[PDB]
């Protein structure tokens, strides 16, 4: 979990807040983001190392790995694995259109990764294209760049279009697995529409049954996927499926008609 800046042979800052792509001696490339600068705390310094070892042990191919933490002379930084193509929305807004087979695979990988997290008792709450990272081979990893699951590191220093209606104007309602199912539905829309969807007048529209316009999807999208996004953004959370439920229907569909 613990790391030093001496371990990094070279680095390079980039802004996608701001991060450093550092080459580690033996492990290779890693992304680095300094959370806060100033004095070294005492009340919460011990917990920040425990919270990192809790996220470090979330080990799945479709989930971003926290590689370590760097604490040195009043600075606090998190170190994750490098994903070469950035985020899903960066990939979707490129010159060339991503094939339907690759989009179908991204969808299945987000399902695999979200079923993993739910099975480990972790609710995402902040699932959006910006938290779906892409490597140079078009395989994805679900991240937590907004620190929604890092409650300690969040205290050391967002998008409403993917947020389920039950959480719009009811911030005390505890987020559930069905909260993420709603967000995934809006991510499905964004994958085939190739853009971000859609304040008080909007939000109140979403609570009454308003959703992103499916007719805005110009490029080809399968009817079973359209049917899946409609079911996942159902206003009632109990009417939505679980990610293992989505997986048992989506995987046979991907393998027969898209792979
Ligand atoms: C350097 N850096 C990071 O290390 C980031 N780590 C994660 O997002 C992360 C998520 C998980 C596992 C995990 C995934 C999904 C839900 C819950 C849990 O493990 N690590 C955090 O802060 C950054 C912010 C911006 C840019 C870069 C970073």
């Amino acid at each position: 979990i613990k790391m030093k800046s001496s371990d990094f042979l070279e680095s390079a800052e980039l802004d996608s807040g701001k991060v450093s792509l550092a080459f580690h001696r033996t492990q290779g490339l890693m992304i680095m983001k300094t959370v806060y600068k100033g004095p070294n705390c005492i009340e919460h310094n011990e917990a920040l190392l425990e919270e990192a070892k809790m996220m470090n042990r979330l080990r799945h191919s479709r989930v971003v790995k926290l590689l370590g933490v760097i604490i040195e002379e009043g600075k606090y930084s998190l170190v994750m694995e490098y994903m070469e193509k950035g985020n899903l929305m960066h990939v979707l807004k490129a010159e060339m259109s991503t094939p339907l087979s690759v989009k179908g695979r991204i969808i299945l990988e987000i399902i695999e990764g979200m079923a993993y997290l739910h099975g480990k008792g972790v609710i995402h709450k902040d699932l959006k294209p910006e938290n779906i990272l892409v490597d140079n081979d078009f395989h994805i990893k679900i991240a937590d760049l907004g620190l929604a699951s890092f409650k300690m590191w969040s205290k050391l220093n967002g998008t409403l279009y993917y947020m389920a209606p039950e959480h719009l104007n009811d911030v005390n309602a505890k987020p559930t697995e069905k909260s993420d199912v709603y967000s995934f539905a809006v991510v499905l829309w964004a994958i085939f529409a190739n853009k971000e969807p859609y304040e008080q007048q909007l939000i109140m529209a979403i609570k009454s049954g308003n959703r992103p316009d499916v007719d805005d999807i110009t490029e080809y999208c399968p009817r079973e996927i359209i049917s899946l996004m409609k079911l996942c953004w159902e206003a009632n959370p109990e009417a939505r499926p679980t990610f293992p439920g989505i997986e048992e229907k989506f995987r046979p569909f991907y393998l027969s008609q898209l792979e």
Side-chain angles (χ1 to χ4, degrees), residues 3-9 11-13 17 19-26 28-42 44-94 97-154 156-198 202-259:
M3 261 197 277
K4 291 178 95 292
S5 57
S6 72
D7 301 321
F8 298 86
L9 300 167
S11 89
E13 200 220 56
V19 291
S20 312
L21 173 48
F23 197 109
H24 184 277
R25 267 176 202 178
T26 314
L29 291 120
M30 303 189 171
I31 287 286
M32 224 207 75
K33 199 243 179 73
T34 311
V35 176
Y36 197 55
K37 295 141 182 186
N40 187 265
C41 286
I42 192 96
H44 307 85
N45 67 346
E46 68 200 313
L48 294 162
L49 296 138
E50 277 267 23
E51 181 151 282
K53 283 188 174 170
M54 210 192 184
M55 301 295 166
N56 178 274
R57 294 168 109 167
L58 290 168
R59 285 142 175 176
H60 190 263
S61 68
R62 320 304 176 199
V63 173
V64 165
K65 194 181 173 199
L66 188 73
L67 306 185
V69 282
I70 299 172
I71 305 172
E72 44 188 46
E73 60 158 44
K75 261 171 81 181
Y76 275 77
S77 307
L78 294 149
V79 193
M80 65 179 183
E81 67 200 326
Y82 177 52
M83 297 293 281
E84 301 94 301
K85 293 274 162 284
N87 77 43
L88 176 60
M89 191 59 67
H90 180 276
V91 171
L92 291 174
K93 286 178 158 176
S97 174
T98 301
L100 166 68
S101 71
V102 175
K103 288 192 176 189
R105 198 181 71 195
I106 287 161
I107 293 163
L108 183 51
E109 288 183 359
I110 293 157
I111 295 154
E112 287 175 328
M114 288 301 301
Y116 176 73
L117 291 173
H118 291 186
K120 291 280 172 110
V122 174
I123 308 305
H124 203 293
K125 311 171 256 82
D126 193 24
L127 182 68
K128 57 200 190 183
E130 305 96 305
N131 276 312
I132 291 153
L133 303 188
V134 196
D135 61 12
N136 45 10
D137 306 288
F138 292 109
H139 294 275
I140 71 88
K141 282 179 188 266
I142 301 155
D144 192 44
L145 306 176
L147 303 180
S149 279
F150 287 88
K151 299 310 202 180
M152 298 289 185
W153 289 87
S154 172
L156 205 69
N157 59 314
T159 308
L160 266 81
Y161 306 147
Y162 301 88
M163 197 188 286
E166 64 267 28
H167 307 311
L168 294 175
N169 300 173
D170 189 348
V171 309
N172 302 322
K174 200 210 170 70
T176 72
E177 295 181 16
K178 308 305 182 79
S179 316
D180 298 341
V181 175
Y182 180 98
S183 309
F184 164 76
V186 186
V187 164
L188 286 184
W189 186 89
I191 286 155
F192 283 100
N194 298 309
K195 64 194 164 272
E196 278 283 311
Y198 306 116
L202 180 56
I203 291 163
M204 198 59 246
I206 296 166
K207 284 189 276 147
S208 314
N210 193 269
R211 297 290 180 264
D213 187 32
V214 162
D215 306 334
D216 211 325
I217 294 161
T218 59
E219 71 140 52
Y220 179 76
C221 172
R223 290 163 60 210
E224 283 167 293
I225 295 191
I226 296 298
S227 179
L228 171 59
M229 78 174 73
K230 285 161 149 63
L231 172 83
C232 290
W233 65 42
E234 205 81 56
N236 185 13
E238 291 188 3
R240 301 168 201 157
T242 62
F243 282 98
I246 294 161
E247 205 180 327
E248 67 179 270
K249 307 176 295 215
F250 196 83
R251 181 181 302 276
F253 159 85
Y254 167 79
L255 302 164
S256 53
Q257 311 176 36
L258 305 188
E259 195 180 61

